[PDB]
Design a protein around this ligand. Sequence first.
Ligand SMILES: Nc1nc2c(ncn2[C@@H]2O[C@H](COP(=O)(O)OP(=O)(O)O)[C@@H](O)[C@H]2O)c(=O)[nH]1
Ligand SMILES: Nc1nc2c(ncn2[C@@H]2O[C@H](COP(=O)(O)OP(=O)(O)O)[C@@H](O)[C@H]2O)c(=O)[nH]1
Ligand SMILES: [Mn+2]
Ligand SMILES: [Mn+2]
Lengths: 342, 342
Amino acid sequence: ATDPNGYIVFCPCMGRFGNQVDQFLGVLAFAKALDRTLVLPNFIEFKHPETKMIPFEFLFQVGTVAKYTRVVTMQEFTKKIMPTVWPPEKRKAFCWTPRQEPGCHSKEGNPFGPYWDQIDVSFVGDEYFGDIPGGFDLKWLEKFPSEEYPVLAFSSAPAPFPSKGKVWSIQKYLRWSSRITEQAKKFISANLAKPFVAVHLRNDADWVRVCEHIDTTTNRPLFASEQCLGEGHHLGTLTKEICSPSKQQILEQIVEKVGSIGAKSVFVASDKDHMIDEINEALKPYEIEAHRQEPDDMYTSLAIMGRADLFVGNCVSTFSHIVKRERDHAGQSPRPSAFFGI
Amino acid sequence: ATDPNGYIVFCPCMGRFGNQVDQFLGVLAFAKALDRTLVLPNFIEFKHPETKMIPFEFLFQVGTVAKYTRVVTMQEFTKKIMPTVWPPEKRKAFCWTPRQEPGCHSKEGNPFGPYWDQIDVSFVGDEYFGDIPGGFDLKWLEKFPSEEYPVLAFSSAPAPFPSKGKVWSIQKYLRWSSRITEQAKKFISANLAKPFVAVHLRNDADWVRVCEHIDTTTNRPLFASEQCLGEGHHLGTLTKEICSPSKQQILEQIVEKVGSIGAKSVFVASDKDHMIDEINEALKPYEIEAHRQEPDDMYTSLAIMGRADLFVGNCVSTFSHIVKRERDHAGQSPRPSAFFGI
Ligand SMILES: Nc1nc2c(ncn2[C@@H]2O[C@H](COP(=O)(O)OP(=O)(O)O)[C@@H](O)[C@H]2O)c(=O)[nH]1
Ligand SMILES: Nc1nc2c(ncn2[C@@H]2O[C@H](COP(=O)(O)OP(=O)(O)O)[C@@H](O)[C@H]2O)c(=O)[nH]1
Ligand SMILES: [Mn+2]
Ligand SMILES: [Mn+2]
């Protein structure tokens, strides 16, 4: 049987993987609060000639996320549930309010178009929820009953971004697929003498520009920055030094952390410059080396960093934030983490 | 001296004139609640080779709107206030939350680009307000103090659409410019024997398509439809017959209303087909005629309809809704109105 309360389906249609996971935690909480089954999203990759959709279960374990709230895979929804529960005629798009005729416009642009195209979904009308007192920070049952609205479909994730502290613990329920876990275990065993320090070096050209725009006087959250500076930055000011450490600062801090734990190796995950030769020179006095995956597979890198004896991340990066939350919440006790410039 | 509490400036960047006015009422209420001076928006026309900005005071009287809340013209803001109060470096865009790197993207598309271009404004950073409990349905003072944030700038009007019943009475404070008022008075005196019925015929091709999409089972508000069917349509179901009356239905109802008030003329405002010859044939038994402006000037048409002995509008149209609110609220007592199919 299908869920009498109905379903929620959405596109994680903002940003790259760290942003998608950040909003997905909020959506999980939203679905549980509404008591509707969540269709697990396809994640989205952009580093290809075309946008590419990745099934949830390629990356994470369905069994584990189900321990938080009721879920179904996109494949089950698409093949088994949709045809009778949600036929083309009742496929309505849900959004906050009409936007610039005025409506949700759920399939314009990228990845909005390709995401819904992938599952052969087009929308035939709009439903608005901006007038519901409190929005999605959980009337919804009053406004959208299951019989007429079996599926709530959102082209934008119905979740805050950046994520609120309240949902960070939901990362406990995102467990890497067995394939990724095994790839991580194998790389560690073959390459990384323990204890090892794992570091995230976020350093592509677009990033340095993001950091150089930091306005220290207004000191607002930027992406994941509350993971080290607290809600609304109550613990301090976000600086360029934290957002984009100098090569010198990276080396000094890696060497310090190697010393602090008696590390026997270093793992580096990077979007661009892994600094392997530079780190290796700096580590010569300790007779250990830094190691990277070739090529650098983002998911296996996240998994390796979650398994590290010590993780040093980038406080602003939502990609680092995945690792921080996993280390904080996957187990019964947190595994230690630090951040550059903190 | 300038307002120590600061300013609000915004683009009425959604839809045509009826939509812009509908959101402007909500923005007026918002500015009064925040106790900031409102920069009066340029309105936007699209029926030209390029988007065209119209100063507020070309259409409405500054003196009258000021009786509701503190306001300044765009010209005063732009020439006298902006240069010292809000220089390029502190021009931040305000939006609900980051949108697809993630941010407000306040100048992408049309009329967003041309609107801010017109006043030589570019933005250098973003501020978000989605995390403020209750949104803009008036913490704002706590989050955005006047000293650092002298000007809150919104690329989307910080107001509901369609407008809520609570702000409809603000139309009392939108009084046509003396130029428009005089044009209306002259047309009435020269052409329209009293008492006269004024009708709004919304009938361009795009409109009939809007109406044909009506889902009577879900019966949600569509544009201005709550002006005749009440909040959330508590009074009835929106039909195609109400949204887009047949020519036959238009004629029958005009003749009925002419009879009801002993009308000595009819005025027709239309976006497309004024039906003058057809209405004239139908009015032959009464020996009166229907009259239109050539060309049909939308603002003078609104003003004429506000002055009519009886107005028959289109319940779905936000353009008709301007007339309904003016007739309800400009004076001490409402002037009578009706709608096709109601
Ligand atoms: N491979 C690999 N790609 C990365 C790394 N770091 C950042 N990227 C890439 O750039 C992206 C990040 O944008 P998002 O994860 O949203 O993280 P933020 O942009 O860091 O908040 C990440 O999905 C990968 O695609 C890494 O360590 N490895
Ligand atoms: N001139 C003239 N233009 C009209 C009339 N009615 C609708 N239009 C045009 O089509 C537009 C309406 O879209 P908007 O006013 O937002 O009204 P809705 O689209 O009717 O909610 C209106 O601004 C004019 O530009 C009319 O009676 N006269
Ligand atoms: Mn990013
Ligand atoms: Mn319209």
